[PDB]
Ligand binder design. Structure first.
Ligand code: NA
Ligand code: NA
Ligand code: NA
Length: 211
């Protein structure tokens, strides 16, 4: 149960296991997708949904669906942010390249992923340099952050990131950070076109869509 904060402005799906036709996204009641501009990590060769390719972007856009870019390569003991400043330049450069190669415009942001529930120490020591490096590569105005509500608050206070996508791992129950553009409300509980999807709700009308 979410505290009321205004109601969803539409559903965006995210998925790593495969590519979903536009017609099936629409049929599922979604208005678009948040798609990976990242490679497949070790142990992730199954992730046929990484990265989004140009042919998919054209399908989605032609059907009037919204596209948002996000970036996540590693996870857990291989989380991207562990490497701080150097890792942020490496991942932002790669994300930038894959975004451009998918047809993504320079007017759209890329949501860098903090797929964790970090301590404030980890945040200051590792995540701050990581996100500052993202901003050095693509610019503040293009830097989005996928993170829990505590981490979004920290970033907002430090001036890091222009777009925020909240996850629930370490977020207070029912809470939606008021700076957030997008909220992941359900993970890996449903399939569309045979592909497992997470469900995200749009919180603000300008949320990083390509168009
Ligand atoms: Na709202
Ligand atoms: Na609303
Ligand atoms: Na809100």
């Amino acid at each position: 149960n979410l505290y009321f904060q205004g109601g969803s402005l539409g559903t965006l799906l995210d998925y790593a296991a495969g590519v979903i036709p536009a017609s099936q996204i629409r049929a599922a009641g979604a208005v678009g997708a948040i798609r990976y501009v990242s490679d497949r990590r070790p142990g992730g060769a199954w992730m046929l949904g990484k990265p989004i390719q140009l042919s998919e972007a054209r399908d989605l856009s032609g059907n009037g669906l919204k596209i948002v870019s996000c970036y996540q390569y590693g996870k857990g003991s291989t989380a991207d942010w562990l490497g701080g400043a150097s890792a942020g330049v490496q991942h932002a450069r790669r994300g930038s390249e894959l975004h451009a190669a998918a047809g993504g415009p320079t007017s759209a942001p890329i949501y860098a992923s903090i797929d964790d529930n970090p301590s404030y120490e980890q945040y200051k020591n590792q995540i701050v340099p990581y996100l500052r490096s993202w901003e050095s590569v693509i610019g503040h105005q293009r830097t989005g952050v996928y993170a829990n509500s505590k981490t979004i608050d920290w970033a907002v206070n430090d001036g890091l990131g222009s777009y925020f996508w909240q996850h629930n791992w370490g977020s207070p129950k029912g809470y939606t950070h008021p700076a957030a553009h997008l909220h992941q409300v359900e993970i890996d509980k449903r399939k569309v076109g045979g592909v497992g999807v997470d469900v995200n709700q749009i919180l603000k009308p300008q949320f990083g869509q390509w168009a």
